[PDB]
Design an enzyme around this catalytic site. Sequence first.
Site, mmCIF file in Angstrom:
data_model
loop_
_atom_site.group_PDB
_atom_site.id
_atom_site.type_symbol
_atom_site.label_atom_id
_atom_site.label_comp_id
_atom_site.label_asym_id
_atom_site.label_seq_id
_atom_site.Cartn_x
_atom_site.Cartn_y
_atom_site.Cartn_z
ATOM 1 N N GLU A 81 3.139 2.273 1.940
ATOM 2 C CA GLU A 81 2.920 2.197 0.700
ATOM 3 C C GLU A 81 1.433 1.582 0.997
ATOM 4 O O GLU A 81 1.195 0.353 1.108
ATOM 5 C CB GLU A 81 3.640 1.159 -0.822
ATOM 6 C CG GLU A 81 2.626 2.352 -1.850
ATOM 7 C CD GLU A 81 2.706 3.927 -2.600
ATOM 8 O OE1 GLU A 81 3.755 4.180 -1.783
ATOM 9 O OE2 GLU A 81 1.767 3.758 -2.572
ATOM 10 N N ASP A 109 8.587 2.636 0.312
ATOM 11 C CA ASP A 109 7.274 1.965 0.596
ATOM 12 C C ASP A 109 7.552 0.396 1.432
ATOM 13 O O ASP A 109 6.597 0.071 1.591
ATOM 14 C CB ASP A 109 7.368 1.136 -0.928
ATOM 15 C CG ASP A 109 7.738 2.535 -2.216
ATOM 16 O OD1 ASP A 109 6.774 3.326 -1.988
ATOM 17 O OD2 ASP A 109 8.512 2.711 -2.887
ATOM 18 N N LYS A 135 15.676 9.045 -8.717
ATOM 19 C CA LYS A 135 14.866 8.822 -8.197
ATOM 20 C C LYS A 135 16.503 8.494 -7.141
ATOM 21 O O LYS A 135 16.574 9.297 -5.506
ATOM 22 C CB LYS A 135 14.378 7.211 -7.772
ATOM 23 C CG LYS A 135 13.083 7.361 -7.750
ATOM 24 C CD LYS A 135 12.634 6.860 -6.604
ATOM 25 C CE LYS A 135 11.071 6.490 -6.400
ATOM 26 N NZ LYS A 135 10.161 7.500 -6.739
HETATM 27 MG MG LIG Z 1 6.075 4.869 -1.474
HETATM 28 MN MN LIG Z 2 8.174 3.866 -4.880
#
Ligand SMILES: [Mg+2]
Ligand SMILES: [Mn+2]
Length: 196
Positions: A81, A109, A135
């Site tokens: 990220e 991430d 998710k």
């Molecule tokens: Mg991400």
């Molecule tokens: Mn995330």
Amino acid sequence: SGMAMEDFVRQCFNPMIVELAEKAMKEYGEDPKIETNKFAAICTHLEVCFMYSDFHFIDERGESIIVEPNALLKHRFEIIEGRDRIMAWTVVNSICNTTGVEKPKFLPDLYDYKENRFIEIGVTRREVHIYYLEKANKIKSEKTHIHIFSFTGEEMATKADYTLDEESRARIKTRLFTIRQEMASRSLWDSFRQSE
Ligand SMILES: [Mg+2]
Ligand SMILES: [Mn+2]
């Protein structure tokens, strides 16, 4: 107008976070002055990823220690990220060469060099459980570990494996709680919660 939330964001988060957030939004044609709740959700997500990674190292002898920086220490987490798409996939591709870990089909991430898995991080203004399920459905790679935080002090993580020590996790849960209190004091919280 979103002036009020835009100003809150700019004083809540450090300037490195605000810049990353504005960069990401500009890149896909989003304007932070207009999508102010989005602006905040990006900074928060960014701040959580960096905190998760803070202070965690593997040393020369090769074990994970906590440091609050000495030249033979390697960062425990790679951070994915915060990068643009080309660079992110460049880091993921380099990581799959280093470790031989299966390449995930979406960008997560973090990568954890101790447990040798990617981490998908989530930050929700709703409930931790239902967010987690939504998710886990959407990823659907038993590869990628999922760790979810809420602004009410809660977390949920794959297989009840919370990865980090309790003190590190408390530091993140306390930060999100304080952000929500600060928003709520300015009556910005219900608008930010409702936009999710
Ligand atoms: Mg991400
Ligand atoms: Mn995330």
